[PDB]
Design a protein around this ligand. Structure first.
Ligand SMILES: O=[N+]([O-])c1ccccc1
Lengths: 148, 150
């Protein structure tokens, strides 16, 4: 059946404004005996989180699925506009979908599916964004997961 | 801090797809389904992950470890288990460990080396893993994950 091949924690990603403590915080926690850092959004307007992995990390002729695991805080706001979800293949083609997070239950981890790919070479980009001029607040990011 | 975990389905293992030599066991890893690679017995022991240097950030010291468990059945571990990181320029971090006499049925993390990427080393394949190709038979090693930290 389907099992996880990789977990990529948000320190492996590029997060716009990620190093500015007005906008993002980083929190050290234990994940299954490994120290990780959650990326905790305080507030940002240009919300953009992208992991980049090469197509050579993966096997050929296999359907992969990706998800991002997040938590909304009690302070969540700005989620009335769709969060765009993307996988970008090396040729520039994209798997595009979206989710509206407004009104979702806070303080529970949930895994947002962000799409599927098959290889049948170069960079694959995984992640999510919303670039509208409103403030997004109160999303904590745990990990990207890639399964097959 | 941990940047990546790579589970053994993402590696290449000699005989790994032959149920006479290796079993794949579905377990939960803090809410993610993973499959442990459970060695029954093999003589050509070889497990390698490949990730591109572009997956990592430049000018950062990374360390890697493999998390394993010996079973009550373990044997053949008086030989050196070779541990390796091969960078895209062919340079290698090489070390070894003797697993004979280690306590079974607990996960333990074997450090396999450290690396930093600058200039042309920032692109091209990095190989991580372990091996022993001697004519003895190794038994009862279960592999959970490769971890890459910085
Ligand atoms: O790679 N090898 O030489 C090898 C492969 C399978 C069995 C024994 C030896």
């Amino acid at each position: 059946g389907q099992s996880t091949h990789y977990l990529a924690f948000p320190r492996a990603s590029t997060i716009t404004w990620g190093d500015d403590t007005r906008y993002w915080s980083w929190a050290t926690v234990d994940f299954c005996s490994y120290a990780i850092e959650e990326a905790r959004l305080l507030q940002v307007s240009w919300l953009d989180c992208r992991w980049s992995m090469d197509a050579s990390d993966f096997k050929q002729d296999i359907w992969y699925n990706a998800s991002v695991e997040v938590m909304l805080t009690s302070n969540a706001s700005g989620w009335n506009v769709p969060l765009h979800l993307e996988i970008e293949l090396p040729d520039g083609s994209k798997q595009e979908s979206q989710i509206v997070l407004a009104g979702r239950q806070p303080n529970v981890w949930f895994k947002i599916p962000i799409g599927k790919f098959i290889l049948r070479s170069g960079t694959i980009r995984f992640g999510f964004y919303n670039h509208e001029g409103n403030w997004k607040r109160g999303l904590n990011i745990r990990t990207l997961a890639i399964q097959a």
